[PDB]
């Protein structure tokens, strides 16, 4: 069972027209942190990572401002070839075995798609809700797809279900994604 | 506390 | 919003095996999720994945400093990399909690890390291969895993279930009982 390799990922992306990017390492899977461009912050997955670590969040928009630059001579080498749109996988769980009124978790797993936007929605009893929800950024995949995460806190109940919609520009239609008690 | 090193990519030819 | 969309994609990849002593790094440019130049460590220098790559594999082999640099960067950042993060990533252990219940029986294995894990059932002693069905490994994208495996049984008066899980973070199994309802109970 002991892991007999691992790989470290320093993976970033720049997408136009979009005008959006991230930089990111991943660890057999999960993301160790990720450096939020807007606030030029290194933000570590697990806060305790920073305890042992830290990262010099300047580097990544360097980075990216490269990226940009090449993504910008691909793009017309190419002569203006666009992505092909690739739909997401969802899937829903709950972090934990439900127990009534025990405050748990629902995840909302986005896999397999390509470029890296999508519209995220949860629903409870059919309206939307947003209390409380985060996300990951866009984790990487060796097929050069992308993954994400969001995430929703809730109290069971036998009474509420709740879906998570997801929109992508590769889906013919938005999809839902339910659960229940 | 330890620093996280990242690489950093190369700019293509831009003429 | 149906403009076209363009996507540069950059990944250093760092490869370890038996520690840090095999350590493979790539370096990976992808136009549109398809990859077109590379380094590759075991290599030494770029070389096109596809046509489109061409004109960057040979720009950047003719910048002889840098290409070293990248050459021993399996050593100054995959490596040392791997120093900083190995007490919290490699060394990292979650236990498992276990919960069986109805649904079929459900073992639920949750919270765990690293993934790796053995989960079992036994009826009455005797382990149960047969109608077991399992959702494999989750990545929860919190450095926790989880996993459920279910037993489709006929579950009888008197039958007592067990789930066992086997996983790094503990040295010996972890076990959880489920019973069937007693029908009738005898002194001896």
Same mark, same amino acid.
């Given at each position: 069972?002991?892991?007999?390799?691992?790989?470290?990922?320093?993976?970033?992306?720049?997408?136009?027209?979009?005008?959006?990017?991230?930089?990111?390492?991943?660890?057999?899977?999960?993301?160790?942190?990720?450096?939020?461009?807007?606030?030029?912050?290194?933000?570590?997955?697990?806060?305790?990572?920073?305890?042992?670590?830290?990262?010099?969040?300047?580097?990544?928009?360097?980075?990216?401002?490269?990226?940009?630059?090449?993504?910008?001579?691909?793009?017309?080498?190419?002569?203006?070839?666009?992505?092909?749109?690739?739909?997401?996988?969802?899937?829903?769980?709950?972090?934990?075995?439900?127990?009534?009124?025990?405050?748990?978790?629902?995840?909302?797993?986005?896999?397999?798609?390509?470029?890296?936007?999508?519209?995220?929605?949860?629903?409870?009893?059919?309206?939307?809700?947003?209390?409380?929800?985060?996300?990951?950024?866009?984790?990487?995949?060796?097929?050069?797809?992308?993954?994400?995460?969001?995430?929703?806190?809730?109290?069971?109940?036998?009474?509420?279900?709740?879906?998570?919609?997801?929109?992508?520009?590769?889906?013919?239609?938005?999809?839902?994604?339910?659960?229940?008690? | 506390?330890?620093?996280?090193?990242?690489?950093?990519?190369?700019?293509?030819?831009?003429? | 919003?149906?403009?076209?969309?363009?996507?540069?994609?950059?990944?250093?990849?760092?490869?370890?095996?038996?520690?840090?002593?095999?350590?493979?790094?790539?370096?990976?440019?992808?136009?549109?999720?398809?990859?077109?130049?590379?380094?590759?460590?075991?290599?030494? /220098?770029?070389?096109?994945?596809?046509?489109?790559?061409?004109?960057?594999?040979?720009?950047?082999?003719?910048?002889?400093?840098?290409?070293?640099?990248?050459?021993?960067?399996?050593?100054?950042?995959?490596?040392?990399?791997?120093?900083?993060?190995?007490?919290?990533?490699?060394?990292?252990?979650?236990?498992?909690?276990?919960?069986?219940?109805?649904?079929?029986?459900?073992?639920?294995?949750?919270?765990?890390?690293?993934?790796?894990?053995?989960?079992?059932?036994?009826?009455?002693?005797?382990? /149960?291969?047969?109608?077991?069905?399992?959702?494999?490994?989750?990545?929860?994208?919190?450095?926790?895993?989880?996993?459920?495996?279910?037993?489709?049984?006929?579950?009888?008066?008197?039958?007592?279930?067990?789930?066992?899980?086997?996983?790094?973070?503990?040295?010996?199994?972890?076990?959880?009982?489920?019973?069937?309802?007693?029908?009738?109970?005898?002194?001896?």
């Amino acid at each position: 069972m002991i892991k007999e390799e691992h790989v470290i990922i320093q993976a970033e992306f720049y997408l136009n027209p979009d005008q959006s990017g991230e930089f990111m390492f991943d660890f057999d899977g999960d993301e160790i942190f990720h450096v939020d461009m807007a606030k030029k912050e290194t933000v570590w997955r697990l806060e305790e990572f920073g305890r042992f670590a830290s990262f010099e969040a300047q580097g990544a928009l360097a980075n990216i401002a490269v990226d940009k630059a090449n993504l910008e001579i691909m793009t017309k080498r190419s002569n203006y070839t666009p992505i092909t749109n690739v739909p997401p996988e969802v899937t829903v769980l709950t972090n934990s075995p439900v127990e009534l009124r025990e405050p748990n978790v629902l995840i909302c797993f986005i896999d397999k798609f390509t470029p890296p936007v999508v519209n995220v929605t949860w629903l409870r009893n059919g309206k939307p809700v947003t209390t409380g929800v985060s996300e990951t950024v866009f984790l990487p995949r060796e097929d050069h797809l992308f993954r994400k995460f969001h995430y929703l806190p809730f109290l069971p109940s036998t009474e509420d279900v709740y879906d998570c919609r997801v929109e992508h520009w590769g889906l013919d239609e938005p999809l839902l994604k339910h659960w229940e008690f | 506390v330890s620093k996280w090193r990242m690489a950093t990519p190369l700019l293509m030819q831009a003429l | 919003d149906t403009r076209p969309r363009f996507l540069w994609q950059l990944k250093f990849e760092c490869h370890f095996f038996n520690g840090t002593e095999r350590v493979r790094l790539l370096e990976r440019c992808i136009y549109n999720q398809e990859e077109s130049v590379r380094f590759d460590s075991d290599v030494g /220098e770029y070389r096109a994945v596809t046509e489109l790559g061409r004109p960057d594999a040979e720009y950047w082999n003719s910048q002889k400093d840098l290409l070293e640099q990248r050459r021993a960067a399996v050593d100054t950042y995959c490596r040392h990399n791997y120093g900083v993060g190995e007490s919290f990533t490699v060394q990292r252990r979650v236990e498992p909690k276990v919960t069986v219940y109805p649904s079929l029986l459900v073992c639920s294995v949750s919270g765990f890390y690293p993934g790796s894990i053995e989960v079992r059932w036994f009826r009455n002693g005797q382990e /149960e291969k047969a109608g077991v069905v399992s959702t494999g490994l989750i990545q929860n994208g919190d450095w926790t895993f989880q996993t459920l495996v279910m037993l489709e049984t006929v579950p009888r008066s008197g039958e007592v279930y067990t789930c066992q899980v086997e996983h790094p973070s503990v040295t010996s199994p972890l076990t959880v009982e489920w019973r069937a309802r007693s029908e009738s109970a005898q002194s001896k």
